[PDB]
Design a protein around this ligand. Structure first.
Ligand code: HX4
Ligand code: AX7
Length: 178
């Protein structure tokens, strides 16, 4: 990830006008799109993307020797590893094979291995990220309508996916489904 950290604008887009900032969300959503996705803008200016999919794989990657999810998050669509690298904090929650798994990153650095924290009957993946204010300048707050515009376009192209957008700062919400 040091290549990304070294030139963030080249991977995520302009880090001063809000372009790159919002592309962080779009990258995560893109990965989720591969049946309901919920994008939430939190009051602390983090965004979370949840789905009810199968959950990303949690087993150890036989080559890298860490969880497959960690490989996805830390090894170079630009890839969610870019989002992770440029987030001061990122929380990953995977519900899969009857288990809830959690992991925290800071600036792309895992704080511990992906760990089983409980049981569940649901499946899905949740990523919540806090963009690094060391990288993103000037425009540092998410603009609802920038997200809504893109998610609407995506909903038309991905006919079987329901997309919800929620703003916890002011209660605004939308539901894109084609
Ligand atoms: N909310 C999410 C994030 C992801 C995801 C899937 C593949 C790679 C990275 C992230 N799925 N659902
Ligand atoms: N604040 C801060 N920024 C960082 C960038 C890379 C690794 C660790 C870091 N801690």
């Amino acid at each position: 990830l040091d290549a990304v950290r070294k030139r963030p604008g080249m991977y995520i887009g302009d880090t001063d006008d809000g372009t790159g900032l919002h592309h962080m969300v779009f990258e995560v959503v893109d990965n989720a799109i591969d049946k309901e996705i919920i994008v939430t803008i939190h009051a602390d200016n983090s965004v979370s993307v949840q789905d009810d999919g199968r959950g990303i794989p949690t087993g150890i990657h036989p080559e890298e020797g860490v969880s497959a999810a960690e490989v996805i998050m830390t090894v170079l669509g630009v890839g969610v590893s870019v989002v992770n690298a440029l987030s001061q904090k990122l929380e990953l929650v995977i519900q899969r094979e009857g288990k809830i798994h959690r992991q925290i990153y800071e600036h792309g650095v895992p704080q511990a291995p992906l760990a089983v924290t409980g049981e569940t009957e649901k499946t899905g993946t949740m990523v919540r990220f806090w963009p690094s204010l060391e990288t993103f300048t000037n425009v540092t707050e998410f603009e609802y309508e920038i997200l809504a515009k893109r998610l609407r376009e995506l909903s038309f192209l991905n006919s079987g996916v329901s997309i919800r957008l929620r703003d916890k700062r002011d209660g605004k919400e939308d539901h894109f489904h084609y």
